[PDB]
Scaffold this active site. Structure first.
Site, PDB file in Angstrom:
ATOM      1  N   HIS B  44       0.758  -1.196   0.000  1.00 44.13           N
ATOM      2  CA  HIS B  44       0.000   0.000   0.000  1.00 44.13           C
ATOM      3  C   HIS B  44       0.821   1.294   0.000  1.00 44.13           C
ATOM      4  CE1 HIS B  44      -1.981  -2.817   3.234  1.00 44.13           C
ATOM      5  NE2 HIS B  44      -2.531  -3.071   2.068  1.00 44.13           N
ATOM      6  N   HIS B  46       1.242   4.597   1.832  1.00 45.03           N
ATOM      7  CA  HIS B  46       0.967   5.241   3.103  1.00 45.03           C
ATOM      8  C   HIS B  46       1.086   6.757   2.912  1.00 45.03           C
ATOM      9  CE1 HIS B  46       0.444   1.869   6.062  1.00 45.03           C
ATOM     10  NE2 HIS B  46       0.728   1.259   4.941  1.00 45.03           N
ATOM     11  N   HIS B  61      -3.040   4.737   5.607  1.00 44.40           N
ATOM     12  CA  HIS B  61      -3.091   4.711   4.142  1.00 44.40           C
ATOM     13  C   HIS B  61      -3.518   6.066   3.557  1.00 44.40           C
ATOM     14  CE1 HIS B  61      -3.441   0.079   4.281  1.00 44.40           C
ATOM     15  NE2 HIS B  61      -2.231   0.584   4.533  1.00 44.40           N
ATOM     16  N   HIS B  69     -10.926   0.806   4.201  1.00 47.25           N
ATOM     17  CA  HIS B  69     -10.011   0.027   3.430  1.00 47.25           C
ATOM     18  C   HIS B  69     -10.719  -0.995   2.577  1.00 47.25           C
ATOM     19  CE1 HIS B  69      -6.188  -2.175   2.910  1.00 47.25           C
ATOM     20  NE2 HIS B  69      -6.924  -3.257   3.069  1.00 47.25           N
ATOM     21  N   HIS B  78      -9.160   2.742   0.009  1.00 52.67           N
ATOM     22  CA  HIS B  78      -8.375   3.986   0.222  1.00 52.67           C
ATOM     23  C   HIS B  78      -7.688   4.132  -1.133  1.00 52.67           C
ATOM     24  CE1 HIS B  78      -7.981   2.628   4.639  1.00 52.67           C
ATOM     25  NE2 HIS B  78      -8.893   3.558   4.486  1.00 52.67           N
ATOM     26  N   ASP B  81      -4.756   1.682  -1.398  1.00 55.23           N
ATOM     27  CA  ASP B  81      -4.925   0.233  -1.366  1.00 55.23           C
ATOM     28  C   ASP B  81      -4.609  -0.480  -2.645  1.00 55.23           C
ATOM     29  OD1 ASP B  81      -5.713   0.550   1.183  1.00 55.23           O
ATOM     30  OD2 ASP B  81      -7.866   0.586   0.864  1.00 55.23           O
ATOM     31  N   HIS B 118       3.948  -5.140   3.558  1.00 53.16           N
ATOM     32  CA  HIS B 118       3.557  -5.637   4.843  1.00 53.16           C
ATOM     33  C   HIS B 118       3.863  -7.114   5.117  1.00 53.16           C
ATOM     34  CE1 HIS B 118       1.251  -2.042   6.297  1.00 53.16           C
ATOM     35  NE2 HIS B 118       0.903  -1.963   4.996  1.00 53.16           N
ATOM     36  N   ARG B 141       5.049  -3.365   8.989  1.00 54.82           N
ATOM     37  CA  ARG B 141       5.678  -2.840   7.795  1.00 54.82           C
ATOM     38  C   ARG B 141       7.078  -3.408   7.663  1.00 54.82           C
ATOM     39  NH1 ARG B 141       3.024   3.257   8.746  1.00 54.82           N
ATOM     40  NH2 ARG B 141       1.076   2.350   9.471  1.00 54.82           N
TER      41      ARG B 141
HETATM   42 CU   LIG Z   1      -0.551  -0.515   4.690  1.00 54.20          CU
HETATM   43 ZN   LIG Z   2      -6.134   0.893   3.120  1.00 58.66          ZN
END
Ligand SMILES: [Cu+2]
Ligand SMILES: [Zn+2]
Ligand SMILES: [Cu+2]
Ligand SMILES: [Zn+2]
Lengths: 151, 151
Positions: B44, B46, B61, B69, B78, B81, B118, B141
């Protein structure tokens, strides 16, 4: 953006955190760099936020107006020419720069570009040679980082 | 900007390089990530390009439209995403995504923000607990990098 941040890292001991804040029509640049040799070190915004080959892939100074290299107070300067930062005997440079050419938005935006701290003092374009007018003879790139949006 | 790049690094062995290119009205994301455990890993954008505290200071995010999400194909997602990347037996994940929400300029610009890989699979907002609706339960992360302008 109105605020940005950059974390400088390289292959040696030089590290630092630089903060940027839009104030009126200027950008205020603050922070500190450690692990530097005592004295002046060139400090510039390089064109690309590309760290695939360390600081080398950052390209040349950010120069959208195709000018020669100068000091921050010169009319003939690259947008990325912020001069020198000065490290004390303990190797620490405190950064406190106010500049009207760099910006955090629009055409001269430095978000996504690279801040570089160099090995030698930047001669501000007054070194007498050809290199002086391209890079200020600042020498190698000790540490660099991509400029990102901060909270 | 029409091209961007991101070098992912973290505290472990996970590393990689992701390129972004505006092709027509969309953005094509390509690259590869190594050092991963086999299987799916949440991938994702951020919000903050702030690495002062490692990947942690990247924030939540990127979500300029204030949605919950979801997966890359959902309406309720988001902007950041991008789903999951999948590592093979060897720990290598190849990235090949086209996305309709992120951009390299304007309001949905991700230049200056952080790409995060992630530890666990992103459940796409369908896990059924509050956490799913925020991060997809993707966990820690592993590696991250600030997205910068490329040549
Ligand atoms: Cu994330
Ligand atoms: Zn998200
Ligand atoms: Cu330089
Ligand atoms: Zn210059």
């Amino acid at each position: 953006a109105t605020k940005a941040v950059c974390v400088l890292k390289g292959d040696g001991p030089v590290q630092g955190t630089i903060h940027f804040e839009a104030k009126g029509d200027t950008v205020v640049v603050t922070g500190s760099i450690t692990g530097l040799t005592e004295g002046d070190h060139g400090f510039h915004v390089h064109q690309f936020g590309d760290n695939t080959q360390g600081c080398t892939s950052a390209g040349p100074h950010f120069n959208p107006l195709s000018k020669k290299h100068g000091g921050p107070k010169d009319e003939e300067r690259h947008v990325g020419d912020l001069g020198n930062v000065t490290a004390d005997k303990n190797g620490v440079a405190i950064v406190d720069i106010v500049d009207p050419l760099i910006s955090l938005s629009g055409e001269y935006s430095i978000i996504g570009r690279t801040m570089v701290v160099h090995e030698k003092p930047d001669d501000l374009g007054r070194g007498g040679n050809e290199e002086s007018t391209k890079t200020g003879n600042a020498g190698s790139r000790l540490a660099c980082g991509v400029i990102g949006i901060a909270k």
